[PDB]
Subunit: 312 residues, 4 copies
Amino acid sequence: MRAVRLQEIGVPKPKGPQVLIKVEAAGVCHSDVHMRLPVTLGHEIAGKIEEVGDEVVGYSKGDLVAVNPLQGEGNCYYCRIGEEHLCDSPRWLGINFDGAYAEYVIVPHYKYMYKLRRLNAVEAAPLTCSGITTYRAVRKASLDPTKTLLVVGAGGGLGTMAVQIAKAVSGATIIGVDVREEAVEAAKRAGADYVINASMQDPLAEIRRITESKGVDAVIDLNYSEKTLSVYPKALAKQGKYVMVGLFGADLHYHAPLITLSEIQFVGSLVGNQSDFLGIMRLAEAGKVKPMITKTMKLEEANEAIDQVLIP
Amino acid sequence: MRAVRLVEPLSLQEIGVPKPKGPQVLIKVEAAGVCHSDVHMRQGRFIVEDLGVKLPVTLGHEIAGKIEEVGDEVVGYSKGDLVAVNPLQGEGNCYYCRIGEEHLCDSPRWLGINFDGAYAEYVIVPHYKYMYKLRRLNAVEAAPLTCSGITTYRAVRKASLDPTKTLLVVGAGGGLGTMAVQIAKAVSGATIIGVDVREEAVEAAKRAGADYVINASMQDPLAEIRRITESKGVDAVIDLNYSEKTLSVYPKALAKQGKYVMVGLFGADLHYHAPLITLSEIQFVGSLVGNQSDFLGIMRLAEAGKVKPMITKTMKLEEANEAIDNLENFKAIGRQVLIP
Amino acid sequence: MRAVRLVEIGKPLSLQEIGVPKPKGPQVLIKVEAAGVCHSDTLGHEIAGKIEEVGDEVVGYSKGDLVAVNPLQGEGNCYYCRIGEEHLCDSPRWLGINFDGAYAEYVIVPHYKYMYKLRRLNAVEAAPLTCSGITTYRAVRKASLDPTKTLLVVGAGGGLGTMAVQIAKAVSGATIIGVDVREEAVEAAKRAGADYVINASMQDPLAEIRRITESKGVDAVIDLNYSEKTLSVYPKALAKQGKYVMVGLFGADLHYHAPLITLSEIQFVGSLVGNQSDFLGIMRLAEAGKVKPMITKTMKLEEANEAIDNRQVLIP
Amino acid sequence: MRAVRLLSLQEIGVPKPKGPQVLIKVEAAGVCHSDVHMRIVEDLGVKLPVTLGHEIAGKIEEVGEVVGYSKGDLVAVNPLQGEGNCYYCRIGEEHLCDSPRWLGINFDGAYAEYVIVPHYKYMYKLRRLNAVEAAPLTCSGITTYRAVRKASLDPTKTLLVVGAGGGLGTMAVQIAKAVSGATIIGVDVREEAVEAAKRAGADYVINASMQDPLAEIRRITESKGVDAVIDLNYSEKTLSVYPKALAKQGKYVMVGLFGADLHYHAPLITLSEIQFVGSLVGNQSDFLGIMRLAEAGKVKPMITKTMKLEEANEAIDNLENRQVLIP
Ligand SMILES: [Zn+2]
Ligand SMILES: [Zn+2]
Ligand SMILES: [Zn+2]
Ligand SMILES: [Zn+2]
Ligand SMILES: [Zn+2]
Ligand SMILES: [Zn+2]
Ligand SMILES: [Zn+2]
Ligand SMILES: [Zn+2]
């Protein structure tokens, strides 16, 4: 089979709880940029089951599935308490284990799969990464009907998904902020109750009016920047939670007395566990959260994409 | 009655004794704790602009004493009862008051801050529900609990501890530190590591109940923490009275999902690389005071003897300015309590 | 002013002519525009109207303001008031129960903090929320729902049922199964947002649930105005770790085999009213249109006895 | 090797550990009332014969992929292991798995000289405790630790432990004392039991044979009642009496399998927001918690009586009328 690695290799044979998948969709995201041994990339997997190991239960050849790529070894503290995404020595498909940048891919254990019924491989693949990430980020915001949330860059891919999830799972008031009329509009279509265009308005001033000067109870900053970190924490209400997600090389700078006086919290997040995967997939399969705007490409265009869902 | 008040140093005035009406309670002060917060008060910063403070005002937010007279609406308390008081009282209408976090009230009634406090012979408690009847503790032992006790109790709760976790208490040999160690020992089951910089402070942390203690002046603290936790790091850090140094050092001891609980008002900034926060799911959380639930918790622990009173130094009401000076010039080791 | 009051147990309410209280301090005098009436029934615990006058200590409210009121107010000193669960206060001040209510032209609200400024809703639309809204909002929270769970609402086509369906739909992301006992009630459950619906008087509820949940059962059941029948049937639909939230006051007992409880880690939990946080939540949702007002029937204050005889909203 | 299976003593072969499996040389096999019931097919899909013993502790004889463990290590084992695909396994509640692998129940247990642990992650290296002290913790320890967590205790609350002087009761008292800060009231029916509850750490003890327990509980709690009751091995009597001691919002944590029904007036439940919650076993988090406590000496081992592997049936008989078998 073909395989873009960090070639023409052989097709692994599934044994035990393993499952061999015929890749129908291999998502690509900025994380693949940080990657670029040998190792096949592709941590956003979706496809049809080609063959299952003798021990596999509940799945048959032909089944359409999406896969949770981050799998813990089980013995460490994080695996034991149920936070395997924070495993000390994880098995990460497309990162430290061969991924979906190929015609076929092996899933260590069948429990990490999710049978697709409503979505197709292309619509699901991105959910195994951005979906899990965003779903956990909303969970960390600790929202309820009495609260108001601010989603930064609400008109982007991650932003609209965050708005959709928050609207489908919390009942909180949602304020989306972006910088272009188009994005602001995308944020509104995602379900934001209020939208702000930082390019035509002072977001803080607008947020202060919307919340009657209280500020927001949570901010979800997906793919934060030095700019966002210096601006949006100012919008936090007392006890507000600033949920940061991403890997940009920037530092958090905040006056300590402001944190203690207002009991604010800065919380980080990046990926997610089986519970997060189950949640986003149930939502997507129910249509409560729509698939990301996607652009399909060929497997050979992998490098191009990195320079988007690849279809073997 | 006599009363030391902030008029613009504090001045000893001779004002009248308020008469309790309705739910109000008149208390004959037996103990008036003094802490660094009173230094901020005397400096003005932190009050008139934001806290609605209107000079002159009797300071003293750490109250304990005997009930002198009660309002006709007061229920469950009688003259002669010995009580401690929760000084932070919400107005009720704001969001924080509605969700039960009145200490974060938009316009609180704060005894000793924007309402007359205990630096006097008598003090009025707006509503009797803010008191706690003492049975085991005396006024002197209880007064500091209304401030440092509530604060530390809440900080421990924010650490989200459980039997599978390990906590690090920074400056574990100090007043606040030993209190945090004791509370964590009594309410969580977590492994407790105390760190300080002096042999006597380190020993005090041990006596407070710490499972492990570290003298950061002798051993590299981070390396010892890694050894004790077998490279995992700690699940929480409680940094009471944080400094520029502690904030730059201890967050590095955090395990994945670790929570760094900062308490205090020192003029310093938190500086941390964002990718480190997201990769490890760490959290930086602030705390300063506490609500009725926090007060209820610390008083129950103290009354049961599960948490010991702070090392105290009793002084007279007229020595209020002196007590506060000892705090400005950091020459006041030991909780100073005024006995009117 | 006019005011229908309970002058004698067993006997009917009497329309007396008492004086209009004068608001002092934090108190607020409301010109009643809507006085809800429910089975729980100067009475009137479902209050909504315009502010007539405010006490000298009132802040944030002015005469003319349209407001809804949380009738259950704690004394503050007891354990429950201290931890923020004042609805379970040991000696509460309950408007319309042990304190004069809204069955009159004017009513005094002990403290302004218990009010909520109406901006989208009118008095009639809001009054019911101060009771059924709070109750249902808290019941949904106790169900501990999330997107991977499924909720069963019993009697989902009724007034409380449709409200519970709407709230669960607007705040949880959970799959919702609604069941009731007559077609009009069933169709109403669908309109309320239930993903699946069932008529228990026409078919066996337990088999359908099994099918829908693919034999897992439901993660939570909210049994509004439970009965001897519901309690003997629906707990059987619970999945492992399922929570059975019972709401109501009917004279019936809960009877369940203990081993079934331990083996599945199920929980039976009761709920009846709610606190300031629940009131804040339901008002926020209603004012935002995320949950619609109850179907109401307006009547006159004089018809109090009549209404109790038979959502009916009295209007002075 | 010898092995008492479903009881008969057989002479079967010693399995060979492959992959993540671990072969343990059993040094302690706890026995509890659950084995009375064992001695399940149509349900748990039990394929007879099967070696009992779900309370495992011993030395690692051989490791299969195994990482972090070596031959000679002393370990205790979490016997309840989920298959992974079901809802409960996915959300981290594998003890409630739809099709679990349960050592000593539907998989060969410790009633033998050797036993296979499917995956090494279910073990816990012993440092302070010996095999005999640890074995019971894999069952009663996990169970009681989870029951205490379900009580939702905190320093502002008070807990009542029923039968506080028994094996499970003192365990519950000790765990609650070490992990919550709640005030603890232990109740029992004999002077000696009441005494055991006190030594366990109870702040207050009640001899229900001398004083009316509900009355004493009200006096202690100043008429509020308790915020939680942990009723380990409940009976028809406990369920009819103690729920009356619950304060508003109180949680009645029931644990056990006795054939009794819960009977309570609904209005009482709704008016007080009380909760009846069941529990029986526990997950990896529960195992980690109880073992950390025990290994730190914060919770003491159960009073134990060691016996021979061949006395398995006798041990179970004794229950029908903490015993640990030593191969
Ligand atoms: Zn990705
Ligand atoms: Zn791991
Ligand atoms: Zn102080
Ligand atoms: Zn307030
Ligand atoms: Zn009503
Ligand atoms: Zn109360
Ligand atoms: Zn057992
Ligand atoms: Zn399972």
